[PDB]
């Protein structure tokens, strides 16, 4: 007591979710035509880095992208022409994430040093400079996303997420419910809700203004390593070292479909959706990333390379292309 | 062909590439070491001998060392352990004396086994440090043996027990072509740098011999 009250609450909430759903989602949507076999081809190969690369992010122009690698450098690429725009030397080489501001004026990186650095791209002196050193966290940084030109959300090893005010430099909100190291997060296109996955094998949606968890999703056997929203901001999918991918509905509070195959036994390092949401992409520990139809749940396609190991991938805003990175220090643009 | 603006941009990109490659070449010379203790082990003593990760770099006999000790990281090491996969060697320290505190030897041994058998990170030789000699010396001439290890079946003092626990550590090493260098530290010596240097040069020789190699 009163620990039994909590399990009773879990019981009625689970039974209510079971009652509120019947589909299955086993025979539904069989009417719509399968998209068939999708072929992808490498179009460019960006080969500047000298060590494992750990994260990448697209700009809003859908032409520039930034990549972060363990050799302690940041690169801004011109994906159209494979030219390097800027090279940024990091203070601490143990970087684990990066993010591109929507306005295109700022870029952020962070990692195993517990602090998040903000870099200014448009200066009078024609060079990049540090603007802030957001240092409130205790565990290592895991992910960063720009809310706007002066608001950034972060996740760390403190089993918590934070919301900052870049000009002020003070944590203006905190989220403290995961009870386990959190690994990733993504922002809804509404730009008012976000979700985060943790090593506790559960996912929780947050309210930016309220600062309190609203819905908790579970039923996933191991760690969670990647999340991304549905294009309309009404769903999201999760990766894992469980070798299984799954998606949830916010208004239904249940799993909808699972993406697993017998041959694949390895973790999942990143996920992303297509512009229409028809194609789900995911990277794996077995050196190649598979492409999954959103709802028919089949491995529609696959991508050759890399040597090892697909650790980060993303899709442009216009959906024109897709990019992947890996521990072999190469980036490939697939179209 | 392509216009003047693109020509200038390509020139800038080539300059960036050249600078980056030169910096990488200059960086590849130094040697990287992971410091990985446990609790009240004398890793702090080793560091002083010389909130997140702490990098200490020094030069010894025209060789540049970079030593990382992830002590403040309280998170799960299964995540983020892969960062130091391309490292020359790791430095492990235990003690010897304390083994009745809960035990200490069992926890250190299981941690050592866990990091000695990893999916990646499997072919990196380990330097082993057994510090605080005098305390372990007194703990036996006063409170033998016990030992926390049963079936020890040996004499009382001193190299008997020392070599026994040492050999216990050189146990549980599945792989060949990977060595464990061991040493005894009195917490007052001043040549641990020399033994680290010797182990590192031995590892370098082993790697060189490795390609044709011709193991």
């Amino acid at each position, epitope marked *: 007591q009163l620990r039994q009250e909590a399990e009773q609450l879990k019981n009625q909430i689970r039974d209510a979710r079971k009652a509120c759903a019947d589909a299955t989602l086993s025979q539904i949507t069989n009417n719509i035509d399968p998209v068939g076999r999708i072929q992808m081809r490498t179009r460019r190969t960006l080969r500047g880095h000298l060590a494992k690369i750990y994260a990448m992010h697209w700009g809003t122009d859908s*032409r*520039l992208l930034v990549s972060a690698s363990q050799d302690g450098k940041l690169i801004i690429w*011109d994906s159209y022409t494979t*030219n390097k*725009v*800027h090279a940024i030397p990091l203070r601490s080489s143990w970087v684990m994430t990066c993010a591109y501001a929507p306005s295109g004026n700022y870029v952020a990186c962070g990692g195993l040093d517990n602090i998040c650095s903000i870099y200014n791209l448009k200066t*009078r*002196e*024609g*060079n990049v400079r540090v603007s802030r050193e957001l240092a409130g966290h205790t565990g290592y940084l895991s992910c960063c996303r720009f809310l706007d030109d002066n608001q950034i959300v972060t996740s760390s090893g403190d089993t918590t997420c934070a919301l900052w005010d870049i000009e002020t430099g003070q944590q203006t909100t905190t989220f403290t419910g995961h009870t386990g190291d959190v690994m990733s997060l993504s922002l809804a296109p509404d730009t008012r809700l976000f979700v985060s996955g943790a090593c506790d094998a559960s996912a929780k949606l947050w309210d930016v203004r309220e600062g309190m968890c609203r819905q908790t999703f579970t039923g996933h056997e191991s760690d969670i390593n990647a999340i991304c929203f549905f294009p309309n901001g009404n769903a999201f999918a999760t990766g894992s070292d469980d070798a299984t991918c799954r998606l949830f509905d916010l208004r239904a509070d249940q799993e909808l479909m699972t993406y697993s195959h017998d041959n694949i036994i390895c973790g999942i390092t990143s996920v992303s959706f297509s512009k229409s949401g028809r194609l789900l992409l995911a990277g794996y520990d077995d050196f190649n990333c598979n492409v999954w139809d959103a709802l028919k749940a089949d491995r529609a396609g696959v991508l050759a390379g890399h040597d090892n190991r697909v650790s980060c991938l993303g899709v442009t805003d216009d959906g024109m292309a897709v990019a992947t990175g890996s521990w072999d220090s190469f980036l490939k643009i697939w179209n | 062909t392509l*216009s*003047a*603006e*693109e*020509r*200038a*941009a390509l*020139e*800038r990109s080539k*300059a960036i590439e050249k600078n980056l490659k030169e910096d990488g070449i200059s960086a590849a010379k130094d040697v990287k070491l992971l410091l990985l203790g446990a609790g009240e082990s004398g890793k702090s003593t080793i560091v002083k001998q010389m909130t997140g990760i702490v990098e200490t770099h020094f030069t010894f006999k025209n060789l540049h060392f970079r030593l990382f000790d992830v002590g403040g990281q309280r998170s799960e090491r299964k995540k983020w352990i892969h960062c130091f996969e391309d490292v020359t060697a790791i430095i492990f320290c235990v003690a010897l004396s304390g083994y009745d505190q809960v035990n200490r030897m069992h926890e250190s041994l299981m941690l050592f086994d866990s990091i000695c058998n990893n999916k990646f990170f499997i072919d990196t030789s380990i330097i082993l440090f057994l510090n605080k000699k005098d305390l372990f010396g007194e703990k036996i001439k006063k409170s033998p043996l016990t030992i926390c290890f049963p079936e020890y079946t040996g004499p009382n003092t001193y190299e008997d027990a020392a070599a026994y626990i040492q050999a216990q550590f050189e146990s549980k090493n599945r792989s060949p072509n990977k060595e464990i260098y061991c040493h005894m530290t009195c917490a007052t010596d001043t040549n641990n740098i020399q033994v680290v240097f010797d182990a590192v040069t031995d590892i370098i020789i082993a790697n060189n011999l490795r390609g044709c190699g011709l193991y």
Partner: single-chain antibody, 233 residues
Framework: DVQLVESGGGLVQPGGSRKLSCSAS????????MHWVRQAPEKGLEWVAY????????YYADTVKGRFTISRDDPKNTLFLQMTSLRSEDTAMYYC??????????????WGQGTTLTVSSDIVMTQATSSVPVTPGESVSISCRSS???????????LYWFLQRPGQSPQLLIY???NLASGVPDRFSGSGSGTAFTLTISRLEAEDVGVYYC?????????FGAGTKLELK
């Protein structure tokens, strides 16, 4: 902050030799390409030389070649222009301009205060006429003409616009004939076809009276248009 100061000029008898220098402060000089632009005592602007960021590429004008040379010393933060066998018409006004070229850059953003000198095919840029009467608070448009179409295969139409208020150095207004420079009122707006170009001014005020120029950057040599000035009828 960012500022370029230059003084190496003076009265020189014909056929002499001279060196010009502008000192760079407040910005990463080593990462910029530099130009020299000459202005005749009456009117007009014409490009002279250019040295790349790493001093690996140099260009000259036609009359410049063989007599003038350009050099930089990045650790010293100085630009050099050497005069030899100066002619009669070389007497004019000079400027050194910074410029950096990457994706989405703004070259020719900042100009120096200039220094004066006294002594004793190509793309054609057309502006006409040279004067239009206006009043404050009402609209006005200025048009410039070229010979070849400026639209490159990329989709970038390389046209630039500059304004020089009397008694001071010119400054950048529009780059690539569709963008707006930093620290510029938004009322300015540039547009045009592949060969014909214009401007628009809304709510014109007394600060905007001066002379305007059009420049193209499609291919060396860089060519300027004529000068068109505004009046306050």
């Amino acid at each position: 902050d960012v500022q370029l100061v230059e003084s190496g000029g003076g009265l020189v008898q014909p056929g002499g030799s001279r060196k010009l220098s502008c000192s760079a402060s407040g910005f990463a000089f080593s990462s910029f390409g530099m130009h020299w632009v000459r202005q005749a005592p009456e009117k007009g602007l014409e490009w002279v030389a250019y040295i790349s960021s790493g001093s690996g590429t140099i260009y000259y004008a036609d009359t410049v070649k063989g007599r003038f040379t350009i050099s930089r010393d990045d650790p010293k933060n100085t630009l050099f222009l050497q005069m030899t066998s100066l002619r009669s018409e070389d007497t004019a006004m000079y400027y050194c301009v910074r410029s950096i070229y990457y994706y989405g850059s703004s070259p020719f953003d900042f100009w120096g205060q200039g220094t004066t000198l006294t002594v004793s095919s190509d793309i054609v840029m057309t502006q006409a006429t040279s004067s239009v009467p206006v009043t404050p608070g009402e609209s006005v448009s200025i048009s410039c003409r070229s010979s070849k179409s400026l639209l490159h295969s990329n989709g970038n139409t390389y046209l630039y616009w500059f304004l020089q208020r009397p008694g001071q150095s010119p400054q950048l207004l529009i780059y690539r004939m569709s963008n707006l420079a930093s620290g510029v009122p938004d009322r300015f707006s540039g547009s045009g076809s592949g060969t014909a170009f214009t401007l628009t001014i809304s709510r014109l005020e007394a600060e905007d009276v001066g002379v305007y120029y059009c420049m193209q950057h499609l291919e060396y040599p860089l060519t300027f248009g004529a000068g068109t000035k505004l009046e306050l009828k």
